[PDB]
Design a protein around this ligand. Structure first.
Ligand SMILES: Nc1ncnc2c1ncn2[C@H]1C[C@H](O)[C@@H](COP(=O)(O)CP(=O)(O)OP(=O)(O)O)O1
Ligand SMILES: [Mn+2]
Ligand SMILES: [Mn+2]
Ligand SMILES: [Mn+2]
Ligand SMILES: [Mn+2]
Ligand SMILES: [Mn+2]
Ligand SMILES: [Mn+2]
Ligand SMILES: [Mn+2]
Ligand code: NA
Ligand code: NA
Ligand code: NA
Ligand code: NA
Ligand code: NA
Ligand code: NA
Length: 326
DNA sequence: CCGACGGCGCATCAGC
DNA sequence: GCTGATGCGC
DNA sequence: GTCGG
């Protein structure tokens, strides 16, 4: 990280616009600048130098000038000191508490962990779990633990049915040394863009994972998407492992590669690829890649049998997962 | 200069 | 009791 | 906040 100082500043500014100002587009503007700067191979020595990069405009070049000259940013100091900004920023660290709830609680005097505890009755099931594992969720997951988790999921899935295919994606697939969570992409021959809805395809797998006490809690659960909490088995007398966030998505089999691309990310990568795909006349989502008509109507789903196929369609140089960390 | 910047599955609950 | 509205996360 | 239109 030749420009870690600057990108950290841009990221903190982004979380502020998202959590406090509730301006999702400023949030995204800051992350775009941070991302583009993180890819720049030279140590930025001024705002004008950074200004050349797409995503970095007048205001960010100015903020960059102050940071290099002073080593800090006045705007961020004010933010850090402000009681409301700081409280809301802290509360959003709880899974289940977004910008709205955080602002709502603070206006009522609930601004700290203790307060959430005191007013637990006011929290919904998701927020209560988030409070319960506040520390655990902020811990990173060592890749070694991820592998152990990967073995258990594929194995338990296999038990339900040998034709299920579970693929760990997200940062893990990108080869990360550690991950914030575990993202599982699931498929089965019986569920395709046609099929006719197969009831409990995800339920069975979720159910099994709960059976062996791997999944300890549920945040959300439907026919195609599961968000929960899981935990590696604890030897016997040793220290329990930290509880971990787990997301599982069941997608149609014939849409596997678009799904793998999407769920492998990174998020910014997805944003980039989709915008680029539009420049080339295509429209991509997590399920398909379609050409855009002369008028604007999206055509039919094009065939895809590898991630590389998608890169080919948009004339982009294929990039291995480890290179999609933008 | 102004306005697009992605869109959706799931849970909750205000308004009736 | 129901559902349209909104939040949340990704 | 930024950039293309
Ligand atoms: N807002 C968004 N728009 C488009 N795509 C988005 C997205 N948020 C997440 N994604 C996609 C790409 C991520 O690799 C993938 C996993 O989503 P994720 O939130 O688990 C983050 P990950 O990249 O796994 O790193 P880590 O911090 O969890 O270890 O989901
Ligand atoms: Mn150069
Ligand atoms: Mn405020
Ligand atoms: Mn207090
Ligand atoms: Mn992840
Ligand atoms: Mn995830
Ligand atoms: Mn492009
Ligand atoms: Mn403007
Ligand atoms: Na620029
Ligand atoms: Na205070
Ligand atoms: Na949160
Ligand atoms: Na995360
Ligand atoms: Na009521
Ligand atoms: Na409804």
């Amino acid at each position: 990280t030749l420009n870690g100082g600057i990108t950290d500043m841009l990221t903190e500014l982004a979380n502020f616009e998202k959590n406090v100002s509730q301006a999702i587009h400023k949030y995204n503007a800051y992350r775009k600048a941070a991302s583009v700067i993180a890819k720049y191979p030279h140590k930025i020595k001024s705002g004008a130098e950074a200004k050349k990069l797409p995503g970095v405009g007048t205001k960010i070049a100015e903020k960059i000038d102050e940071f290099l000259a002073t080593g800090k940013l006045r705007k961020l100091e004010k933010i850090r000191q402000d009681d409301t900004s700081s409280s809301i920023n802290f509360l959003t660290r709880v899974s289940g508490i977004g910008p709205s709830a955080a602002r709502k609680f603070v206006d009522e005097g609930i601004k700290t962990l203790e307060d959430l505890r005191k007013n637990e009755d006011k929290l919904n099931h998701h927020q209560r779990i988030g409070l319960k594992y506040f520390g655990d969720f902020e811990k990173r997951i060592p890749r070694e633990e991820m592998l152990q988790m990967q073995d258990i999921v594929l194995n338990e899935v296999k038990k339900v049915d040998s034709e299920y295919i579970a693929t760990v994606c997200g940062s893990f697939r990108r080869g990360a040394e550690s991950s914030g969570d575990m993202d599982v992409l699931l498929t089965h021959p019986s569920f395709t863009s046609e099929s006719t809805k197969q009831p409990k395809l995800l339920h069975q797998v979720v159910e099994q994972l709960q059976k062996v006490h791997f999944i300890t809690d549920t945040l959300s659960k439907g026919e195609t998407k599961f968000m929960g909490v899981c935990q590696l088995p604890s030897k016997n007398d040793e220290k329990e492992y930290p509880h971990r966030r787990i997301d599982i998505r069941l997608i149609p089999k014939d849409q596997y590669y678009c799904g793998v691309l999407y769920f492998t990310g990174s998020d910014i990568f997805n944003k980039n690829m989709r915008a680029h795909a539009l420049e080339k006349g295509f429209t991509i989502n997590e399920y398909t890649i379609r050409p855009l008509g002369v008028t604007g109507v999206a055509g039919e789903p094009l065939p895809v049998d590898s991630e590389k196929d998608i890169f080919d369609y948009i004339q982009w140089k294929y990039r291995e997962p480890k290179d999609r960390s933008e």
